[PDB]
């Protein structure tokens, strides 16, 4: 495997580690979640373009579509949380306990 695939997979790993390590803001974690799908899009299109899988060229567009559907869902939940508490801090999401 070339080093380009290594860099894209490392980018996905970095974006995944960012999401799993919150700081204060839910918006920052939503941005980290959006980056993972960007890395997935780049990796998928690099793989498909290199193997000339012609009919697979439509897959990254569907990937983007469901990516922004998830982004919309996250934004809606974020506005509800911000209306409830005044800030998008994840510390306020502590009413429910394990």
């Amino acid at each position: 495997m070339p080093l380009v695939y290594m860099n894209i997979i490392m980018a996905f790993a970095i974006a995944l580690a960012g999401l799993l390590m919150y700081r204060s803001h839910l918006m920052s974690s939503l941005l980290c979640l959006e980056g993972m799908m960007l890395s997935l899009f780049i990796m998928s299109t690099l793989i498909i373009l290199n193997t000339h899988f012609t009919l697979a060229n439509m897959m990254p567009i569907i990937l983007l579509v469901f990516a922004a559907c998830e982004a919309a869902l996250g934004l809606s939940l974020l506005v509800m949380v911000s209306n409830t508490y005044g800030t998008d801090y994840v510390q306020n999401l502590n009413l429910l306990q394990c």
């Binding site: 999401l19 799993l20 390590m21 919150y22 994840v90 510390q91 999401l93 502590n94 429910l96 306990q97």
Partner: protein, 54 residues
């Protein structure tokens, strides 16, 4: 009656097991419900599964 039946036969098998189960139950259920905490736990679990399992 007292030393064996009422004290040590109760202490060994049934009481110690119940105490251990209660302690483990408290330990597991004592969570503040913080997504930051258990997502850090998720990251640790993912790293361990990737490295220690082949």
């Amino acid at each position: 009656s007292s030393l064996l039946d009422l004290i040590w036969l109760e202490t060994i098998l049934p009481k110690t097991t119940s105490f251990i189960q209660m302690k483990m139950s408290i330990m597991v259920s004592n969570q503040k419900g913080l997504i930051k905490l258990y997502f850090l736990s998720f990251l640790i679990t993912i790293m361990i599964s990737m490295t220690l399992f082949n």
